[PDB]
Scaffold this active site. Structure first.
Site: not given
Ligand SMILES: O=C(O)CCC(=O)C(=O)O
Length: 346
Positions: A212, A231, A287
């Protein structure tokens, strides 16, 4: 239905962000300038774990490594990994390809648009409101299964840059090996056989790696929104790369801690799946992600998840006893996800 990408909204000339992006009053009180937060060196800090000796022949040296990993996983559940074995140039190539894909126009990227109404979750998209509040986050993304190779649908992967598939697939293979190394160390940490945790999450045949890429366009009112809501990851493990622009924050000891950018490191999260299996010993930390008005932030998160229906997730028997009751009831991966939604939805 209207399809509006945050990138578009970010370049529409708005001076103020739409209401759907503003967080509730109570949440806004905890959101500050990410650059100021990044500077702060007060309070608990995300741990940096050196994996250089994770598989050393020198027993004493190896155990020290494993112990450090265990301690960070039991306390924070999140850490900056260094000397993780993933070539720096490979990571640089992956990030470069990602930046190039997102540098394409929104219109070009729409050719890769996902379609949730028909189950086509892979591709270019943005979080759709899933509850009464109608809250939206300041982010666009690209999502796709990355491993095992036989399960990939290469036809949806970016064709620009020309090496996206090559760099990403190479990176995925490398991460899969690192995951096996971490699983073994964490297994030993719980006093379990080395191969136990990976087996419990599907092994080489069923464990999935989802990629992602998170794109956070500059935001005009950065302190009123979130790039990612608060979350916990539902994965077993999550490995993340970012373009050295701060944004990740962790809810530790009741306070939001800002992660500092560590060169060539890979952020690793213990996810809900491992927290459940370990009966809460390994922590899946809450986080979130902050946006800013000065620089575009990009992160590459690869979630190592168990098959969604095939495995009933619950604390392992060895982790449960009369004195240490189960902190989680049995649920398959898909059922856990739905239960967390059900909680917020309600
Ligand atoms: O942008 C980030 O450091 C992580 C993104 C995130 O929480 C996820 O892809 O679940």
């Amino acid at each position: 239905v209207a399809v509006e990408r945050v990138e578009s909204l970010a370049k529409s000339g708005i001076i103020s962000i739409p209401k759907e992006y503003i967080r509730p009053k109570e949440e806004l009180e905890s959101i500050n300038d990410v650059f100021l937060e990044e500077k702060k060196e007060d309070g608990p800090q995300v741990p940096t774990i050196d994996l250089k000796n994770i598989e050393s022949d020198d027993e004493k040296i190896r155990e020290n490594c494993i112990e450090e990993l265990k301690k960070a996983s039991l306390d924070w559940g999140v850490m900056h990994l260094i000397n993780h074995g993933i070539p720096a140039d490979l990571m640089e190539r992956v990030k470069k390809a990602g930046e190039e894909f997102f540098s394409l126009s929104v219109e070009e990227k729409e050719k890769y648009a996902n379609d949730q109404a028909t189950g086509k979750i892979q591709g270019y998209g943005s979080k759709l409101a899933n509850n009464a509040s109608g809250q939206l986050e300041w982010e666009d993304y690209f999502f796709h299964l990355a491993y095992p190779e036989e399960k990939r649908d290469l036809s949806i992967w970016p064709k620009t840059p020309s090496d996206y598939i090559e760099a990403t697939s190479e990176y995925a293979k490398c991460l899969r090996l690192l995951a096996t190394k971490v699983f073994k160390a964490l297994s030993v940490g719980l006093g379990l056989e080395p191969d136990r945790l990976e087996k419990e999450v599907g092994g080489l045949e069923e464990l999935l790696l989802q990629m992602k890429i998170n794109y956070y366009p500059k935001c005009p009112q950065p302190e009123l929104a979130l790039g990612v809501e608060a979350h916990t990851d539902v994965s077993a493990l999550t490995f993340i790369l970012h373009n050295m622009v701060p944004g990740l924050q962790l809810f530790y000891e009741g306070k939001w801690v800002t992660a500092k950018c560590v060169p060539d490191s890979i952020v690793m999260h213990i996810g809900d799946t491992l927290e459940i299996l370990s009966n809460g010993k390994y922590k899946s930390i809450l986080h979130r992600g902050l946006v800013n008005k000065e620089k575009v932030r990009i992160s590459w998160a690869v979630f190592c998840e168990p098959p969604k229906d095939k495995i009933v997730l619950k604390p392992l028997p060895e982790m449960v006893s009369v004195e240490s009751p189960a902190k989680f009831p049995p649920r398959t991966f898909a059922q856990h996800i739905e239960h967390k939604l059900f909680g917020k939805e309600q």
